[PDB]
Design a protein around this ligand. Structure first.
Ligand SMILES: CC(=O)O[C@H]1C(=O)[C@@]2(C)[C@H]([C@H](OC(=O)c3ccccc3)[C@]3(O)C[C@H](OC(=O)[C@H](O)[C@@H](NC(=O)c4ccccc4)c4ccccc4)C(C)=C1C3(C)C)[C@]1(OC(C)=O)CO[C@@H]1C[C@@H]2O
Ligand SMILES: CC(=O)O[C@H]1C(=O)[C@@]2(C)[C@H]([C@H](OC(=O)c3ccccc3)[C@]3(O)C[C@H](OC(=O)[C@H](O)[C@@H](NC(=O)c4ccccc4)c4ccccc4)C(C)=C1C3(C)C)[C@]1(OC(C)=O)CO[C@@H]1C[C@@H]2O
Ligand SMILES: CC[C@H](/C=C(/C)[C@@H]1C[C@@H](OC)C[C@H](O)C(C)(C)[C@@]2(O)O[C@@H](C[C@@H](OC)[C@H](O)C(=O)O1)C[C@@H](OC)[C@H]2O)CO
Ligand SMILES: CC[C@H](/C=C(/C)[C@@H]1C[C@@H](OC)C[C@H](O)C(C)(C)[C@@]2(O)O[C@@H](C[C@@H](OC)[C@H](O)C(=O)O1)C[C@@H](OC)[C@H]2O)CO
Ligand SMILES: Nc1nc2c(ncn2[C@@H]2O[C@H](COP(=O)(O)OP(=O)(O)OP(=O)(O)O)[C@@H](O)[C@H]2O)c(=O)[nH]1
Ligand SMILES: Nc1nc2c(ncn2[C@@H]2O[C@H](COP(=O)(O)OP(=O)(O)OP(=O)(O)O)[C@@H](O)[C@H]2O)c(=O)[nH]1
Ligand SMILES: Nc1nc2c(ncn2[C@@H]2O[C@H](COP(=O)(O)OP(=O)(O)O)[C@@H](O)[C@H]2O)c(=O)[nH]1
Ligand SMILES: Nc1nc2c(ncn2[C@@H]2O[C@H](COP(=O)(O)OP(=O)(O)O)[C@@H](O)[C@H]2O)c(=O)[nH]1
Ligand SMILES: [Mg+2]
Ligand SMILES: [Mg+2]
Lengths: 427, 426, 427, 426
């Protein structure tokens, strides 16, 4: 069957993974200890009955994984799936890659191989990292490269924490992200990217919450992930396998970045002041502020769009909605693509956790989008990098562990090329 | 992993150290004899970061006490938490330094340093993965200043891939506290610029201002000053000892805070700082906390940061808080007053946060600033130095121990170069 | 179906809207919480069964809407339909328009669009403001202008609080009203205007109440509104749709102002000392003091009259009454209009709220009137404005926010033109 | 939104302030320590208008206390409601002003004003949407008069789009209360004409008349006078704190009350004012209330409004009332005595009403009058000024602090122009 493995790497990735696992447990009826039909896509079938997931959990930081190992979702995990080392990169690309990561990576590969050995049709991977964080950027890149050698035909999807233009966390992100882009590019297939500023905005407006945490964010991410994956596991009108997200979303083999957005993301309060019909949901999906990154999508033609409807969904309504969207003048599309939309309709609805603010909905959607409008963010990032690098800010740290500066230049060139390609596409 | 070895040097260094060990003890639920009496498993998870374990569930500071001047360390020993230290970790000589850097660095200190090195080596072997060394000393004395520098040199030589951080008590330039202080400070700074990865610069003048202007306090003792220092110190390493959302680390902070290798002199702060009496008049919002953190009057170095640009800033929060609130606050600060942060580094700030507030507070925060304004401090010291050295005043005390004029000159030159470099990024 | 939205803007408007909603709840059987046939004209059909209105609730004043949000008619409303800001204009036309309103207006427009997206035949709007109040005059004008761009074919009816000649509230009304007239004129279709002095007079004589409030006034207004709208919702002999009030009431495309008057407005006491026959009601409607503005209608020819009979009504009787009215010498009519009267007869009677003084009547009427007799009031207003403006009273406030003084002159010119047109019509 | 920052300046300003904070506290159900003990949610809906919230459901006046003269503020602190104020909001110096405007405005006050500005800025940041600043001071002193003006200047400069209103205690022209009073008053008025949007002019003579003639009272203390002032103040802002039919606001009142930018000097009043003893002899009809409001003997400025025309009048009612009754009453008043309201402004009156009577009363009302008669007050002050200044009497005390003769002259000129303008609309 359509049966697969996940990868959660670095602090952020691990956090996301926890949430994901919780969501999965809710969905498939599994109790935190492994006790309870088609669950087995992730949870490789087990000895005494108690289910155990297929996820690679990696952190060179001990602390986050240590927390997990003394949590509630604890015995659920295999000891080995969770991996440990000694110290952070500390936002240092030249440590996940090159120096310290080239040591653990072998172990990770072995684990992955072992996991694969249970599949009877390994459709691919899901990878969780951060365009920014030191471990989950260099290390993840390295891992992806390794996988490329050992699994050429298998899809490798990535869930990515792009840094928002204005807001920041650690002031060496512009280097790290760029480096990741340079070395991820050719080894991944798809990189689903979500900002944090956008999420915060959504929370403030749509969910009516002005005091968020990371936990909430993680839950939201997990929801999206679930939406993406549910066609593997449950039945459906139209089933979108992992390998479709290659072919209905990558118009050219360097453009690997889609924006992942969810709806309806509205709390219980003015949910009952709403219909929550299919058309409305679709409309919400294409609006600017509901997107989970900081693009003005009205500034950029859509290349490929992909929608994953869940729950009580009649295809006719969906079709109507899509037609309406097509009709709209502001939702721009490329010169070379008429069949812009890819639709998945799944008989199982989304499932809501205790503590998760998003209330119970009979129907919901996850949208995946490729556009020239992502290029703005890239350009901004490039600019940031250039401003940093001319005065040689913090270069000696990465170079002092094991790097050429020409690498940086190469990365910049690559970015420029990407930009040019985007421009061409727009034309 | 992530284990830290602590060294305290000289009188100041020892005194601050005592307070630091009290505070850390309290934090980790260690009683004055060394027994654990905590109620949370969070407390012991990473207790190894500061403490070694012994027979009978005994916990012992991974701490070395050094002084050529004997008696100061005897006071430490006599003290309440003095009984937690390993007797074999007291390294002391039989002669003072007369506030003489040369005696600490070249002659008297050289005779004692072997012992200290031996102890340090021993300590290093009980690290699963040594994070680095943390030193507490003073510039202006002989032992902390000279011998501290000497020891740092040795340790960097032996463990160049582990992090070397120093909490160094510098002079109060408007009212200086010894006569040869400028000489000592200048000599030390030279060594520290080259042989440490980060130096937290604390000055008593600033502390007193904090006590009086901000905390609304009077009759403050050296104990109280030590307390303040200890709180910052503990804050610095919180993310190695405990859980959180974004977890900091020593090199992580260095990575975000040191954009050129020699510019590693930080101004530490703590927040909140309000009066004990007027408690209810204020409350703990993240914005208020950040305001307190960022205001010049609340810093513990002798600068007006408003007379320079921030190269980089690290904020470390403790307590469960809205990341949205944090990030947005930072953004607003940057937008409103962009002139005070150098424009050549997009996002000068950094956030870290730990889910575990210290004792009383729900929300606490530690500030680490790297500003071009700190040039002022060095500039004044160099001015002080020059006025004396051009007349070779007090120089015989140092030449008598084998130091050469040329060395002094070179130290001055290096100090000036540092200043120049800082001015570049202003 | 004939299915539509309302707009309630400013303090007064909001107050009126509350009353209106209460009345609607009474009429259609809906409980204050949304629980219970043809209700759905306003109450767009809902998810779990509990009905939610289609009204735009806007106030730059927080306070009034805050009150609503903690009232009884509370969960009934959607959170978004009610809108908030920060501070009043403070009877300052140059703040609803120009400065502060150009900020919120977008949101309002979005809301309106969303509401429209539920209609299967949006017949138009109902707008509640004040010729005088700072928010609901500038802001409302702005809103109307915006709507004109986004809905050209859709009717936009307005319910208006004209200031009475003698009585006043806030002593910058003469500016504001005039400004509103200047900028409303070409974007609205109909502006149903009610004074307060007239209402008070009615209360003193007809209802036998000498200690009124705003609440009573609001209730009265709501009654009128209900009468206007009931042909959309319930069955009838003759059904007057919203779009009829364009075509049977606007003889020329600048004359957009009718007087809205109700009968019988008599309490329980000397109701039983009365027959309350159709003819009597009709007579009452055309009498001077029962009108809800301060015109002497005997000083002015009628252009178009429109009557909306409700309850136990036989058309023959109505016809007879109309004939009688026509016969009367004092009820003057224009040279150019023979078919002066437009009649709507509705099988559902009016419905009386607990607390509302007007007792239960088997039959009742609402009358809408265009005449040259409205021009007197306009003239008075103009005079007031001119007296104010020559010494430059309070001009620096509006000008100091963002205005030309030439605007004032333009407004005056417009008023003059209107007057001239009225004169011509009279001729 | 709609948040107000309160400043109290000088002795008078502080004393009135204390009373004001007592009264507001009572109104909002705040007890003397700062705990809420109300029974209505109406009380807290807009509590933010005057109070900040702190940890433990503590409410703190958004209030700043300023005096160069120390000790007056110590009395405030010692007082019952003194404990509600934030200690950091007490800004005071170490020297009096000797009733000297120049010392308040130019020299001594300039040294203290920075602190006040800093506090004000801090206060401003805790406003969602700052409505404006409300000041309490006195003309005739040095601090309230000079430093008050100084502070107002600064604040207008920094927040020119927020409303600046002052409750200013002026002289009693028939029996003046200091010797340099005229100088001070004249100097202040100059500043206030230019840098505030509205000034409520209160005079002790009028208050005493009210107490004696109207309220039938004797032995009245400054406390009692403060009470009366505080009641008007609270009335003024009721519509920002509470619900109603027609809700007022600061700028709304300014919009209806200031037909020319410089004519913003108001005569405040309260009604009802009858004896405590003879309570039952009268009752609370709207007509009676309006009669009380409009009668000259019931006003708190030192004019006969019958010796001038009303440019505009704002009445603010509290209690549930017939709007018909209100409007009709107003109309009747205007019709009967049209000569007392300028004929060039149709509808000189304004009504506002709030559904929430204060403590005892079912029906209360606040009067705000803008009459051409107030020229009398200014005229007398200018007369006083001239008689002294033409002999340069007492002038050395001011020139000694750097003030120039020309300034005095200019102030007089401006005052005269004000008078002339008022006479125009008479
Ligand atoms: C009733 C109550 O809540 O009392 C508070 C208190 O009033 C205040 C004023 C405390 C008080 O601190 C000081 O007055 C102070 C004295 C000298 C130097 C510096 C500070 C307090 O003494 C300090 C004490 O701090 C702690 O408990 C922390 O865990 C702190 N502990 C120590 O410093 C410590 C003291 C003695 C013995 C062992 C440890 C800490 C801070 C950072 C990292 C680790 C530990 C607290 C909250 C208070 C008192 C007791 C009055 C404040 O300081 C700290 C460090 O919390 C001063 O401003 C804060 C705000 C607090 O609310
Ligand atoms: C038994 C009874 O009904 O007593 C009344 C009373 O006799 C009268 C005479 C009160 C009384 O007021 C005075 O005598 C007075 C004294 C000095 C200055 C001014 C007035 C009263 O003291 C004042 C008091 O006022 C209030 O309670 C209001 O809420 C008022 N509160 C305060 O001023 C206040 C006093 C002390 C502590 C805290 C607040 C208020 C008014 C406007 C805005 C906010 C609050 C009331 C009605 C009375 C007494 C107690 C006798 C009157 O005043 C007020 C402000 O209400 C004077 O004329 C009115 C009519 C009242 O009927
Ligand atoms: C961002 C880096 C930073 C730069 C500045 C200037 C920052 C910005 C703001 O704080 C974050 C100021 C702040 O918003 C306030 C106005 C509330 C306030 O705190 O300002 C100070 C004076 C100010 O310097 C003028 C202060 O010393 C300071 O450092 O300010 C008086 C104080 O009295 C209570 C209060 O009025 C330096 O690290
Ligand atoms: C309208 C603005 C207004 C103008 C006037 C003159 C108003 C009108 C009326 O009040 C509203 C007077 C009022 O109707 C009364 C006759 C009952 C009465 O109150 O008049 C005063 C004297 C009168 O001035 C003569 C008063 O001082 C005053 O101000 O009157 C004595 C008094 O003894 C009990 C009583 O007899 C000034 O603000
Ligand atoms: N959405 C979300 N973002 C997170 C989370 N944790 C961290 N981040 C983001 O990830 C970035 C930081 O990377 P981390 O994953 O913390 O870093 P790391 O991979 O552990 O790498 P080092 O700590 O540098 O070794 C920042 O942009 C954070 O906002 C999380 O739980 N959820
Ligand atoms: N009939 C009726 N009239 C009202 C009501 N509220 C206010 N008014 C009238 O409306 C006018 C005042 O306008 P408001 O609506 O209060 O003012 P606003 O729109 O809030 O504008 P600003 O307050 O100036 O920002 C006056 O003529 C009042 O008599 C009400 O509930 N019913
Ligand atoms: N903050 C702080 N400063 C100290 C302490 N003890 C001494 N000092 C300062 O350290 C300097 C004197 O050096 P000290 O350490 O006593 O001399 P040493 O023993 O030769 O190193 C002066 O600037 C003192 O103010 C202390 O406990 N805390
Ligand atoms: N109404 C009132 N007037 C006061 C009060 N205290 C002082 N005054 C008056 O204020 C003037 C004296 O100024 P004051 O404020 O005491 O001087 P300052 O401290 O220099 O500003 C005189 O006209 C006094 O009658 C008070 O509490 N209430
Ligand atoms: Mg990490
Ligand atoms: Mg309003």
């Amino acid at each position: 069957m359509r049966e697969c493995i996940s990868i959660h790497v670095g602090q952020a990735g691990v956090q996301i993974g926890n949430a994901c696992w919780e969501l999965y447990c809710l969905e498939h009826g599994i109790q935190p200890d492994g006790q309870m039909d088609s669950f087995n896509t992730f949870f490789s079938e087990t000895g005494a009955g108690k289910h155990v997931p297929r996820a690679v959990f990696v952190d060179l930081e001990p602390t986050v994984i240590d927390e997990v190992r003394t949590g509630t979702y604890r015995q659920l995990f295999h000891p080995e799936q969770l991996i440990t080392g000694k110290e952070d990169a500390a936002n240092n690309y030249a440590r996940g890659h090159y120096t310290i990561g080239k040591e653990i990576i072998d172990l990770v590969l072995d684990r992955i191989r072992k996991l694969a050995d249970q599949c009877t049709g390994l459709q691919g991977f899901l990878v969780f990292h951060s365009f920014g964080g030191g471990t989950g950027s260099g290390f993840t890149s390295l891992l992806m490269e390794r996988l490329s050698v050992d699994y050429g035909k298998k899809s490798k999807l990535e869930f990515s924490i792009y840094p928002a233009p204005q807001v920041s966390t650690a002031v060496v992100e512009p280097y790290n992200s760029i480096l990741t882009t340079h070395t991820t590019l050719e080894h991944s297939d798809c990189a689903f990217m979500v900002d944090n500023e956008a999420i915060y905005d959504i929370c403030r407006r749509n969910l009516d919450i002005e005091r968020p945490t990371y936990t909430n964010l993680n839950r939201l991410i997990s929801q999206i992930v679930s939406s993406i994956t549910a066609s593997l596991r449950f039945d459906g009108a139209l089933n979108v396998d992992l390998t479709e997200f290659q072919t209905n979303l990558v118009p050219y083999p360097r453009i690997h970045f889609p924006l992942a957005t969810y709806a309806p993301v509205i709390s219980a309060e003015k949910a009952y002041h709403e219909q929550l019909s299919v058309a409305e949901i679709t409309n919400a999906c294409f609006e600017p502020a509901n997107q989970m990154v900081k693009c003005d999508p009205r500034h950029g033609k859509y290349m490929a769009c992909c929608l994953l409807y869940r729950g009580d969904v009649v295809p006719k309504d969906v079709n109507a909605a899509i037609a309406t969207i097509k009709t709209k003048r502001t939702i721009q599309f490329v010169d070379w693509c008429p069949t812009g939309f890819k639709v998945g309709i799944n008989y199982q609805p989304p499932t809501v956790v205790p503590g998760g603010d998003l209330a119970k909905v009979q129907r919901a959607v996850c949208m995946l989008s490729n556009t020239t409008a992502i290029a703005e963010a890239w350009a901004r990032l490039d600019h940031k990098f250039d401003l940093m690098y001319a005065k040689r800010a913090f270069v000696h740290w990465y170079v002092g562990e094991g790097m050429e500066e020409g690498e940086f230049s190469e990365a910049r060139e690559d970015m420029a090329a990407l930009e040019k390609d985007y421009e061409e596409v727009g034309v | 992993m992530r284990e830290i070895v602590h060294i305290q040097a000289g009188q100041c260094g020892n005194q601050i150290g005592a307070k630091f060990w009290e505070v850390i003890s309290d934090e980790h639920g260690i009683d004055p004899t060394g027994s654990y009496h905590g109620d949370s498993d969070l407390q012991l998870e990473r207790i190894n970061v500061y403490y070694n374990e012994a027979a009978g569930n005994k916990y012992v500071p991974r701490a070395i006490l050094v002084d050529l001047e004997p008696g100061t360390m005897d006071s430490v020993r006599s003290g309440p938490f003095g009984q937690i230290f390993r007797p074999d970790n007291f390294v002391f000589g039989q002669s003072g330094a007369g506030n003489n850097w040369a005696k600490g660095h070249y002659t008297e200190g050289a005779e004692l340093v072997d012992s200290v090195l031996d102890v340090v080596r021993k300590e290093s072997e009980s690290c699963d993965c040594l994070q680095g060394f943390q030193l507490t000393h003073s510039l202006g004395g002989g032992t902390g200043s000279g011998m501290g520098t000497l020891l740092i040199s040795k340790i960097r030589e032996e463990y160049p891939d582990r992090i070397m951080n120093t909490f160094s008590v510098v002079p109060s330039p408007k009212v200086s506290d010894t006569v040869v202080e400028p000489y000592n400070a200048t000599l030390s700074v030279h060594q520290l610029v080259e042989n440490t990865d980060e130096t937290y610069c604390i000055d008593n003048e600033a502390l007193y201002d904090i006590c009086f202007r901000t905390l609304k306090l009077t009759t403050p003792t050296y104990g109280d000053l030590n307390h303040l220092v200890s709180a910052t110190m503990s804050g610095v390493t919180t993310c190695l000892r405990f859980p959180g959302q974004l977890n900091a680390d020593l090199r992580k902070l260095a990575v975000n805070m040191v954009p050129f290798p020699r510019l590693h002199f930080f101004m530490p702060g703590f927040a909140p700082l309000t009066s004990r009496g007027s408690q209810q008049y204020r409350a703990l919002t993240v914005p208020e906390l950040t305001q307190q953190m960022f205001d010049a009057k609340n810093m513990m170095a002798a600068c007006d940061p408003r007379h320079g640009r921030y190269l980089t800033v690290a904020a470390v929060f403790r307590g469960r808080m809205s990341m949205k609130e944090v990030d947005e606050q930072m953004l607003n600060v940057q937008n409103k007053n962009s002139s005070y942060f150098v424009e050549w580094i997009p996002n000068n700030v950094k956030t870290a946060v730990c889910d575990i507030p210290p004792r009383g507070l729900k929300m606490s925060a530690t500030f680490i600033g790297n500003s071009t304004a700190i040039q002022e401090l060095f500039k004044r010291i160099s001015e002080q130095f020059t006025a004396m050295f051009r007349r070779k005043a007090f120089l015989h005390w140092y030449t008598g121990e084998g130091m050469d004029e040329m060395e002094f000159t070179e130290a001055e030159s290096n100090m000036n170069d540092l200043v120049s470099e800082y001015q570049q990024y202003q």
